[PDB]
Design a protein around this ligand. Structure first.
Ligand SMILES: Nc1ncnc2c1ncn2[C@@H]1O[C@H](COP(=O)(O)OP(=O)(O)NP(=O)(O)O)[C@@H](O)[C@H]1O
Ligand SMILES: Nc1ncnc2c1ncn2[C@@H]1O[C@H](COP(=O)(O)OP(=O)(O)NP(=O)(O)O)[C@@H](O)[C@H]1O
Ligand SMILES: [Mg+2]
Ligand SMILES: [Mg+2]
Lengths: 283, 292
């Protein structure tokens, strides 16, 4: 059913801040229930209407939409706490983002994971697709680790909580149609999904690293995608190229995406090649 | 003409040691001429007959061969100093080897140099070819920097100063043309092989060839036609010249003359043949295309 627990500011306490972002500031904090006994570790995201024009006193149906979703591979929303500014509350994952992870560990990661995370991310995303929830900010910074083996999609729907404002970058993940016509769809997420796997296999590389943001659309419009990561067979890189296929209706469903990476995960090294040691051995 | 200055141990003084190697130990030292005034910075290499069987009291014609060579892109031999152990004397180059260089600087180096050193190394080597001097140990550790722009081939001929001992090599087979590894057959074209592995060393910004492999597998895999892989900065043109160097057929491998020509014209448009990441990770691939 479509609901969401509401919190009282007397139950939520912020301890220290984790960081800000596109639109919002995440805090580490606890939650003391009406038992008043022990404190539960939680993560409090604070959203505001920048302009100080509208407030978050009323609960919308969209907050209920976010608030009611639950899947093994998402960071479920524990509840909201309305007020002049919105406070989203979720579980606290000390393992940080998946991006910060593939940077402080690189290829040392099992080639089995670097495919098991492609599968996991795809299921959560497929789940959201099922219940008609568009993400609008899928990325490796926006994937969190729960088990050292298990990830979870996070920070979804959060964009449709605010009035447009293409002045604030997430564009390096946006399907081109979203960049031209603010047209966000499940298939625009699929695009964003491709750039995330790139992020992954690239062991945490910033896309379009030395380019200028305004050139990002043009070059892309000209048919230039991100290059192939140095660990991917042309099979693991072909799935990404589909994600960025200009035609929305052509891009794979997360269902498809989930299938490929699941069977590709049956033979990890056959599709991923992580240097045991420069290059070597090439006829 | 074919000669070489002989030194007296009273003129040569060793100050501190730089390192050992395959067969020999290089020292930093000075040379006080019979003026006895000032001391000239020099580099003294010490060679011995390991087994303590033969000595280096007599000068051979080969020492004269090494001793008489002079080209802008070699480390000329200043002279020899015979004795129970041989002492080769050359200029001292504080800029160390070219290998230790492309490691402490990587791609920051001008793509213009990484081709200007391929040219320079090729000329020196061609020079040696002219005067019939085979090197037998060409490598990036064996190339030295004189100007921050100019390199010089070093440590040549030094192998033919010793009786064959193919177990003390413990490298340098990771540079040896395969025929030299099978049949101790060292030739100008075996050097060309060694030259290829050195450019690799270069563009690879100082990577140890066959990094995680086992030495005994090096010949087999190679015999099976597997060469070193392509460095991540080389167009398929700068990597094709290397593949020729390792072409099993000696008579097919490029002369250093050829090698000198390609790299000289390739040096006319540095980025057109070398691509050094201005940033981390790949980026901007040509728009690929799936199949249904
Ligand atoms: N459940 C969590 N447990 C621990 N840390 C979290 C959790 N959720 C978010 N964070 C961290 O909160 C920090 C700041 O919030 P956020 O605005 O999401 O960062 P961000 O990198 O900008 N992602 P985004 O703004 O969505 O593009 C991040 O660096 C997160 O990894
Ligand atoms: N002319 C020179 N000026 C400064 N350093 C030098 C000079 N010649 C040799 N060296 C250094 O001397 C050290 C030890 O001598 P050497 O045995 O030649 O080293 P190596 O790395 O083993 N080369 P090789 O033995 O020929 O395979 C090296 O690390 C050199 O860089
Ligand atoms: Mg986030
Ligand atoms: Mg040397």
């Amino acid at each position: 059913k479509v609901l969401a627990r509401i919190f009282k500011e007397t139950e939520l306490r912020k301890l220290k801040v984790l960081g800000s972002g596109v639109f919002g500031t995440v805090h580490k904090g606890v939650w003391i229930p009406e038992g008043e006994s022990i404190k539960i570790p939680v993560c409090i995201k604070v959203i505001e209407d920048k302009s100080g024009r509208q407030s978050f006193q009323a609960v919308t149906d969209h907050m209920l939409a976010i608030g009611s979703l639950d899947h093994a591979h998402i960071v479920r929303l524990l509840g909201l706490c309305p007020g002049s500014s919105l406070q989203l509350v979720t579980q606290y994952l000390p393992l940080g983002s998946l991006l910060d992870h593939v940077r402080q560990h690189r290829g040392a990661l099992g080639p089995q994971l670097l495919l098991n995370w492609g599968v996991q991310i795809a299921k959560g995303m497929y789940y959201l697709e099922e219940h008609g929830m568009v993400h609008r900010n899928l990325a490796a910074r926006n994937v969190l680790l729960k088990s050292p083996s298990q990830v979870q999609v996070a920070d979804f729907g959060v964009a449709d909580l605010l009035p447009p404002d293409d002045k604030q970058t997430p564009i390096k993940w946006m399907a081109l149609e979203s960049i031209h016509f603010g047209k966000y769809t499940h298939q625009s997420d699929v695009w964003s999904y491709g750039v995330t796997v790139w992020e992954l296999m690239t062991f945490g590389a910033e896309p379009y690293a030395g380019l200028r943001l305004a050139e990002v659309p043009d070059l892309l419009e000209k048919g230039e995608r991100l290059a192939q990561p140095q660990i991917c067979t042309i099979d693991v890189y072909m799935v990404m190229v589909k994600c960025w296929m200009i035609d929305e209706n052509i891009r794979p469903t997360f269902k498809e995406l989930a299938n490929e990476f699941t069977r590709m995960a049956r033979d990890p090294p056959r599709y991923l090649v992580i240097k045991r040691e420069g290059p070597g051995i090439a006829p």
